[PDB]
Ligand binder design. Structure first.
Ligand SMILES: CC(=O)NCCc1ccc(O)c(-c2c(O)c(O)c3c(c2O)C(=O)c2c(cc(O)c(C(=O)O)c2C(=O)O)C3=O)c1
Ligand SMILES: [Mn+2]
Ligand SMILES: [Mn+2]
Ligand SMILES: [Zn+2]
Ligand SMILES: [Zn+2]
Length: 144
């Protein structure tokens, strides 16, 4: 179906995606910040922390060009997306019911692209891209 890049695409816009949700109210936020002066954040209800991370990747896919670099802190989101790509049309593959709909809409957007670089970085303190989208999605959701 597809195969992602092992290194980021030189020259392409980078999307620092992030998502945050509250367990008690199920309210959440998902968005991104880019290295070309672009940002977005959406408010979500009846969501989970894993659902907000996948939604942030979906927003970066629909708002980017044919070549996109995406930096997430989500090992689940990177894992469940990469495993879907590596195990399509294979024998021992079974789709997880956990967020089956949301991941399916991401794969449909992934195929429409020509070059996608998905990488995981740990959530860190600083002034970099992951730290800016961090404060945007956590505002009013969790204490940082
Ligand atoms: C970092 C820090 O001390 N202060 C900065 C503000 C602050 C305070 C507490 C936080 O918890 C975070 C915080 C984030 O903002 C955030 O976005 C994330 C995490 C965070 O912890 C994760 O932990 C985390 C995240 C994605 C993952 O996929 C995993 C996984 O896949 O396993 C984990 C994991 O926990 O394992 C993730 O996206 C941010
Ligand atoms: Mn995150
Ligand atoms: Mn974060
Ligand atoms: Zn191209
Ligand atoms: Zn950073």
């Amino acid at each position: 179906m597809y195969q992602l890049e092992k290194e980021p695409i030189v020259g392409a816009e980078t999307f620092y995606v992030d998502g945050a949700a509250n367990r008690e109210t199920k309210l959440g936020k998902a968005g991104y910040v880019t290295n070309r002066g672009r940002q977005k954040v959406v408010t979500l209800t009846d969501t989970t922390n894993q659902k907000t991370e996948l939604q942030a990747i979906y927003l970066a896919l629909q708002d980017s060009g044919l070549e996109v670099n995406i930096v997430t802190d989500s090992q689940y989101a990177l894992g469940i997306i990469t495993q879907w790509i590596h195990n399509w049309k294979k024998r021992g593959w079974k789709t997880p019911v956990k967020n089956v709909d949301l991941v399916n809409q991401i794969i449909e957007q992934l195929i429409k692209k020509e070059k996608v670089y998905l990488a995981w970085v740990p959530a860190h303190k600083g002034i970099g891209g992951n730290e800016q989208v961090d404060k945007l999605v956590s505002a009013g959701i969790r204490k940082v």
